[PDB]
């Protein structure tokens, strides 16, 4: 009955190789995926910084706006 068990094992093995290959492909996908989120993160901090800067500038401009407006 060893022949049947060897044919079954070889079948299951063909299946394992299939799955592991598809798997490795997905893992490559994951490395570029990590790089990508790190970028989005970077972009977000860059943008918050810009927003914060514009907010200070804006508040300055607005102050002068109030004082000059009621002054003249």
């Amino acid at each position: 009955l060893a022949e049947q068990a060897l044919a079954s094992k070889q079948l299951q093995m063909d299946e394992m190789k299939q799955t592991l290959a598809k798997q490795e492909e997905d893992l490559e996908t994951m490395a570029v995926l990590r790089a990508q989120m790190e970028v989005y993160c970077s972009d977000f901090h860059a943008e918050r910084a810009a927003r914060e800067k514009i907010h200070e500038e804006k508040e300055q401009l607005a102050l002068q706006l109030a004082i000059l407006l009621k002054e003249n």
């Binding site: 993160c41 977000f44 918050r48 927003r51 914060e52 800067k53 907010h55 200070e56 508040e59």
Partner: protein
């Protein structure tokens, strides 16, 4: 169904939920437990994103199953505060938020204890009991931090 959650660093403590309890309910349990708002809890069901307008039966939340939460970079609401040095810092808040909670977040960014902080929104000094919602503090409102004791 007692149920658990993996986090970005990964964290798990005491819990219970029912198939009827909303997908917003579990995340509300997450706010109540971890101090992390609902608009910052990104929830997954085994590689799938738990959505809104669907009970946890609609996926479904079997007991002893690992959903996932990772932290959104920001929430829906943020306000600016003018700093002791006149610089802008921006804070993640909710209208729910008490002034005691905002002063904790400012203490977080700038390291001055809330007992030495005075917050001014529209000429008005804000008290540690009330909320941003009450004071009609909206998106992008600026508050002025000052040293209580005047400086």
């Amino acid at each position: 169904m007692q149920i658990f959650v993996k986090t970005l660093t990964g964290k798990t403590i005491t819990l219970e939920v029912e198939p009827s309890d909303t997908i917003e309910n579990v995340k509300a349990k997450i706010q109540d437990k971890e101090g992390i708002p609902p608009d910052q809890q990104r929830l997954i069901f085994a590689g799938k994103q738990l959505e809104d307008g669907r009970t946890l039966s609609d996926y479904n939340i079997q007991k002893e199953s690992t959903l996932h939460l990772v932290l959104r970079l920001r929430g829906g609401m943020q306000i600016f505060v003018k700093t002791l040095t006149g610089k802008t810092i921006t804070l993640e808040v909710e209208p729910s938020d008490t002034i005691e909670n905002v002063k904790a977040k400012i203490q977080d960014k700038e390291g001055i204890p809330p007992d030495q902080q005075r917050l001014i929104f529209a000429g008005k000094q804000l008290e540690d009991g009330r909320t941003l919602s009450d004071y009609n503090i909206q998106k992008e409102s600026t508050l002025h931090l000052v040293l209580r004791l005047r400086g």
